[PDB]
């Protein structure tokens, strides 16, 4: 049976409007009056971050705030503005201020929490990640929160999943993982791909289920439990 349902909250439960506005506000704060378009800085930042994280995929963990600060240092040198001090504070303030959940998130977590172990699996440093979840009002809706910093490795390393399962006290066969990107297979978890806009059809085959609204998750799991 299914006894645990895991999510990737800061990555699949944050509205894209909200995620973009947070990142734009960060860029705007960094630049101040410097004569560079913040949307151009943002696009270039997302480029270098994606690249830097892929270099680390599956590797031993290194603080993500440190990696992002190197990226911003490259951008400051590239465009000529002064490297912002305390960038991690700027980012955490802007996320707590403007971060936003998809509309059905709270209802879905509250409904699962009575009958299942509800967990979060996150690739974000633990301290800022947990402060963000508190600001969003969902930290205490989770039975467990597990990060790559706790596990010691970046995805797709299985270790983060092994630890999340240990916290829930079950083997992979008893759990589902809801993510928006397709490591996790050898452990036996049931994968649900969240594809709100039907934009990742080429990756549907590598997922056991595909949804566009999180309210479909309770149905899949209630179904799987006879």
Author numbering: 1 to 182, 188 to 231
Paper text:
SNAr1.3 can operate at a rate of 0.15 s−1, perform more than 4,000 turnovers and can accept a broad range of electrophilic and nucleophilic coupling partners, including those that allow construction of challenging 1,1-diaryl quaternary stereocentres. Biochemical, structural and computational studies provide insights into the catalytic mechanism of SNAr1.3, including the emergence of a halide binding pocket shaped by key catalytic residues Arg124 and Asp125. In summary, we have established a biocatalytic solution to SNAr chemistry, one of the most important classes of transformations in the chemical industry.
Notably, iodide was found to be a more potent inhibitor of SNAr1.3, with an IC50 value of 1.20 ± 0.05 mM. The resulting structure reveals two internal iodide binding sites, with the most occupied site (about 85%) shaped by Met64, Arg65, Arg124, Asp125 and Pro128. Notably, Arg and Asp residues are a common feature of halide binding sites in natural proteins, despite the latter being negatively charged. Guided by the structural analysis, we performed site-directed mutagenesis of residues lining the halide binding site. R124A and D125N/A mutations led to substantial 180-fold and 68-fold/22-fold reductions in rate, respectively, with more modest 5.4-fold and 10-fold rate reductions observed with M64A and R65A. These assays further underscore the importance of the halide binding motif to efficient catalysis, although the large contribution made by Arg124 could also be ascribed to its role in nucleophile activation (vide infra). Notably, although high levels of selectivity were preserved with the M64A, R65A and D125A halide cavity mutations, the R124A mutation led to a substantial loss of enantioselectivity, suggesting that Arg124 may also play a role in positioning and/or activating the nucleophile 1 for selective catalysis. This hypothesis is supported by molecular dynamics simulations that reveal productive conformations with the enolate of 1 forming hydrogen bonding interactions with Arg124.
